[PDB]
Design a protein around this motif. Structure first.
Motif, PDB file in Angstrom:
ATOM      1  N   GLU B  44      56.690  39.948  51.142  1.00 32.44           N
ATOM      2  CA  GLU B  44      56.392  38.525  51.238  1.00 32.44           C
ATOM      3  C   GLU B  44      54.963  38.227  50.794  1.00 32.44           C
ATOM      4  OE1 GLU B  44      58.318  36.102  51.788  1.00 32.44           O
ATOM      5  OE2 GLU B  44      60.139  37.076  52.531  1.00 32.44           O
ATOM      6  N   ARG B  45      54.794  37.080  50.138  1.00 35.13           N
ATOM      7  CA  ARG B  45      53.494  36.704  49.598  1.00 35.13           C
ATOM      8  C   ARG B  45      52.433  36.722  50.691  1.00 35.13           C
ATOM      9  NH1 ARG B  45      57.101  32.747  47.651  1.00 35.13           N
ATOM     10  NH2 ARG B  45      56.205  31.206  49.088  1.00 35.13           N
ATOM     11  N   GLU B  46      51.275  37.296  50.375  1.00 37.47           N
ATOM     12  CA  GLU B  46      50.151  37.358  51.296  1.00 37.47           C
ATOM     13  C   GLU B  46      48.889  36.872  50.595  1.00 37.47           C
ATOM     14  OE1 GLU B  46      47.373  39.834  51.765  1.00 37.47           O
ATOM     15  OE2 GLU B  46      47.555  40.468  49.675  1.00 37.47           O
ATOM     16  N   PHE B  47      47.788  36.847  51.341  1.00 34.91           N
ATOM     17  CA  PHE B  47      46.575  36.178  50.891  1.00 34.91           C
ATOM     18  C   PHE B  47      45.573  37.171  50.313  1.00 34.91           C
ATOM     19  CE2 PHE B  47      42.272  34.708  51.584  1.00 34.91           C
ATOM     20  CZ  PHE B  47      42.304  33.428  51.075  1.00 34.91           C
ATOM     21  N   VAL B  48      44.735  36.688  49.390  1.00 40.23           N
ATOM     22  CA  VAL B  48      43.684  37.487  48.769  1.00 40.23           C
ATOM     23  C   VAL B  48      42.316  36.826  48.912  1.00 40.23           C
ATOM     24  CG1 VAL B  48      44.243  36.492  46.498  1.00 40.23           C
ATOM     25  CG2 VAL B  48      42.875  38.589  46.650  1.00 40.23           C
ATOM     26  N   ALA B  49      42.182  35.586  48.445  1.00 35.72           N
ATOM     27  CA  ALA B  49      40.890  34.912  48.461  1.00 35.72           C
ATOM     28  C   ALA B  49      41.097  33.423  48.228  1.00 35.72           C
ATOM     29  CB  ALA B  49      39.942  35.494  47.407  1.00 35.72           C
ATOM     30  N   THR B  52      36.582  27.194  50.003  1.00 39.83           N
ATOM     31  CA  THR B  52      36.618  26.052  50.905  1.00 39.83           C
ATOM     32  C   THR B  52      36.513  24.751  50.119  1.00 39.83           C
ATOM     33  OG1 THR B  52      34.227  26.252  51.244  1.00 39.83           O
ATOM     34  CG2 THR B  52      35.675  27.333  52.849  1.00 39.83           C
ATOM     35  N   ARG B  53      37.156  23.706  50.645  1.00 40.26           N
ATOM     36  CA  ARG B  53      37.139  22.415  49.965  1.00 40.26           C
ATOM     37  C   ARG B  53      35.718  21.879  49.840  1.00 40.26           C
ATOM     38  NH1 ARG B  53      39.190  16.586  52.212  1.00 40.26           N
ATOM     39  NH2 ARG B  53      38.549  15.435  50.340  1.00 40.26           N
ATOM     40  N   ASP B  54      34.922  22.000  50.904  1.00 42.00           N
ATOM     41  CA  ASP B  54      33.538  21.544  50.853  1.00 42.00           C
ATOM     42  C   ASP B  54      32.676  22.412  49.944  1.00 42.00           C
ATOM     43  OD1 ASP B  54      33.357  23.856  52.281  1.00 42.00           O
ATOM     44  OD2 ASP B  54      32.401  22.979  54.052  1.00 42.00           O
ATOM     45  N   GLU B  55      33.146  23.606  49.584  1.00 47.36           N
ATOM     46  CA  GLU B  55      32.491  24.523  48.656  1.00 47.36           C
ATOM     47  C   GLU B  55      31.313  25.262  49.279  1.00 47.36           C
ATOM     48  OE1 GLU B  55      34.326  24.139  46.009  1.00 47.36           O
ATOM     49  OE2 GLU B  55      33.546  25.610  44.579  1.00 47.36           O
ATOM     50  N   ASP B  56      31.032  25.064  50.568  1.00 52.23           N
ATOM     51  CA  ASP B  56      29.891  25.718  51.195  1.00 52.23           C
ATOM     52  C   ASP B  56      30.016  27.236  51.212  1.00 52.23           C
ATOM     53  OD1 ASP B  56      31.964  25.918  52.947  1.00 52.23           O
ATOM     54  OD2 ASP B  56      30.885  25.156  54.700  1.00 52.23           O
ATOM     55  N   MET B  57      31.196  27.765  51.525  1.00 50.92           N
ATOM     56  CA  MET B  57      31.387  29.206  51.626  1.00 50.92           C
ATOM     57  C   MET B  57      32.829  29.527  51.262  1.00 50.92           C
ATOM     58  SD  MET B  57      33.501  29.895  54.317  1.00 50.92           S
ATOM     59  CE  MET B  57      33.056  31.510  54.950  1.00 50.92           C
ATOM     60  N   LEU B  58      33.106  30.821  51.101  1.00 57.56           N
ATOM     61  CA  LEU B  58      34.385  31.279  50.581  1.00 57.56           C
ATOM     62  C   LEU B  58      34.808  32.554  51.299  1.00 57.56           C
ATOM     63  CD1 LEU B  58      33.865  32.927  47.077  1.00 57.56           C
ATOM     64  CD2 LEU B  58      32.016  32.522  48.704  1.00 57.56           C
ATOM     65  N   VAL B  64      39.507  43.404  49.737  1.00 60.84           N
ATOM     66  CA  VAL B  64      38.571  43.040  48.678  1.00 60.84           C
ATOM     67  C   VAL B  64      37.409  42.256  49.274  1.00 60.84           C
ATOM     68  CG1 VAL B  64      40.484  42.993  47.048  1.00 60.84           C
ATOM     69  CG2 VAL B  64      39.671  40.851  48.085  1.00 60.84           C
ATOM     70  N   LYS B  65      37.062  42.557  50.525  1.00 59.75           N
ATOM     71  CA  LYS B  65      35.976  41.860  51.203  1.00 59.75           C
ATOM     72  C   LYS B  65      34.664  42.048  50.452  1.00 59.75           C
ATOM     73  CE  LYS B  65      36.025  39.577  53.588  1.00 59.75           C
ATOM     74  NZ  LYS B  65      35.922  38.101  53.749  1.00 59.75           N
ATOM     75  N   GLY B  66      33.955  40.950  50.201  1.00 57.36           N
ATOM     76  CA  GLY B  66      32.677  41.016  49.522  1.00 57.36           C
ATOM     77  C   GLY B  66      32.709  41.668  48.159  1.00 57.36           C
ATOM     78  N   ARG B  67      33.714  41.365  47.337  1.00 55.72           N
ATOM     79  CA  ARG B  67      33.847  41.970  46.016  1.00 55.72           C
ATOM     80  C   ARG B  67      33.977  40.950  44.893  1.00 55.72           C
ATOM     81  NH1 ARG B  67      34.218  47.087  47.656  1.00 55.72           N
ATOM     82  NH2 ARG B  67      35.622  47.635  49.380  1.00 55.72           N
ATOM     83  N   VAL B  79      39.386  26.542  37.887  1.00 54.49           N
ATOM     84  CA  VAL B  79      38.955  27.445  38.949  1.00 54.49           C
ATOM     85  C   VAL B  79      38.561  28.779  38.331  1.00 54.49           C
ATOM     86  CG1 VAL B  79      39.509  28.332  41.239  1.00 54.49           C
ATOM     87  CG2 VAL B  79      40.692  26.293  40.358  1.00 54.49           C
ATOM     88  N   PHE B  80      37.449  29.340  38.798  1.00 57.76           N
ATOM     89  CA  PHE B  80      36.976  30.649  38.372  1.00 57.76           C
ATOM     90  C   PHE B  80      37.214  31.661  39.484  1.00 57.76           C
ATOM     91  CE2 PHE B  80      35.149  31.187  34.293  1.00 57.76           C
ATOM     92  CZ  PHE B  80      34.705  29.955  33.859  1.00 57.76           C
ATOM     93  N   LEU B  81      37.680  32.853  39.108  1.00 59.39           N
ATOM     94  CA  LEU B  81      37.926  33.921  40.077  1.00 59.39           C
ATOM     95  C   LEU B  81      37.711  35.252  39.361  1.00 59.39           C
ATOM     96  CD1 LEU B  81      38.915  35.259  42.694  1.00 59.39           C
ATOM     97  CD2 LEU B  81      41.251  34.794  41.943  1.00 59.39           C
ATOM     98  N   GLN B  82      36.550  35.861  39.588  1.00 66.60           N
ATOM     99  CA  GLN B  82      36.218  37.150  38.997  1.00 66.60           C
ATOM    100  C   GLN B  82      36.644  38.268  39.939  1.00 66.60           C
ATOM    101  OE1 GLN B  82      35.848  39.498  36.485  1.00 66.60           O
ATOM    102  NE2 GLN B  82      34.424  37.962  35.678  1.00 66.60           N
ATOM    103  N   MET B  83      37.126  39.366  39.366  1.00 66.02           N
ATOM    104  CA  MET B  83      37.547  40.531  40.130  1.00 66.02           C
ATOM    105  C   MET B  83      36.674  41.725  39.769  1.00 66.02           C
ATOM    106  SD  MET B  83      41.702  40.160  39.969  1.00 66.02           S
ATOM    107  CE  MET B  83      42.016  41.554  41.048  1.00 66.02           C
TER     108      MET B  83
END
Lengths: 49, 126, 49
Positions: B44-49, B52-58, B64-67, B79-83
């Motif tokens: 079943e689909r799970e979460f990665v990253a 936040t809507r306010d953009e303050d933090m993510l 993949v904590k802190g990566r 949307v940008f998402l670097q791996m």
């Protein structure tokens, strides 16, 4: 039986519902001796809302 | 018409870098929070990253904590998402999704995302 | 709390006169989902009711 002043009755209210605010000071002990004569203490209070 | 598009993904050498981007039509990133999900066959689909809507933090997943690094541009609706530090086990089928409503905050678990993306797949090999 | 039960066991507690920890709750990672309505969490800390 204890031969000392004690509190055993509480008729201030009969029920308490819908608590909204609470507050209390540190526990203490106040003398309840039946003093006689003049008043040695004068306490003044003012209440405003 | 409301529809979501996905880009990036594919096969990337182990230890390299991969870029994931997606766009949404009929909605703006600022109003609706954006989140990413990854799935494997027979699971079943799970979460990665997510961001936040306010953009303050993510928020990043435990694996993949802190990566990664997530950026957004309100002037073009993308949307940008670097791996980074990708591993072999990181392979899965990633989705780009938008939250159900424009409420503030973030939501990483639960099926709170009403609309899902194209489900582009990402593969890691050495 | 160890009394957590299913949805059928609804509950309601009233909290008054305390200094909260909105920032700690927001930045805590244990909580899976924090989606809030009507006010942004950043503005939620400054404003209150």
């Amino acid at each position: 039986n204890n031969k000392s002043w004690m509190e055993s009755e509480f008729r201030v209210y009969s029920s308490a519902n819908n608590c909204t605010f609470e507050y209390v000071s540190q526990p203490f002990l106040m003398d309840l001796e039946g003093k006689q004569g003049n008043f040695k203490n004068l306490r003044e209070f003012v209440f405003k809302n | 018409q409301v529809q979501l598009v996905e880009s990036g993904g594919g096969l990337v050498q182990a230890g390299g870098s991969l870029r994931l981007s997606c766009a949404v039509s009929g909605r703006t990133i600022s109003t609706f929070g954006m989140g990413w999900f990854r799935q494997a066959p027979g699971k079943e689909r799970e979460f990665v990253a997510t961001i936040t809507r306010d953009e303050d933090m993510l928020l990043y997943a435990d694996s993949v904590k802190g990566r990664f690094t997530i950026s957004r541009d309100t002037a073009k609706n993308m949307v940008f998402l670097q791996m980074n530090s990708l591993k072999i086990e990181d392979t899965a089928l990633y989705y780009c999704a938008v939250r159900r409503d424009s409420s503030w905050g973030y939501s990483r678990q639960s099926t709170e995302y009403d609309y899902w993306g194209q489900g582009t797949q990402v593969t890691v090999s050495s | 709390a160890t009394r957590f039960a299913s949805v059928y066991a609804w509950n309601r507690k009233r909290i008054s006169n305390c200094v909260a920890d909105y920032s700690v709750l927001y930045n805590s990672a244990s909580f899976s989902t924090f989606k809030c309505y009507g006010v942004s969490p950043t503005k939620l800390n400054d404003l209150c009711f």
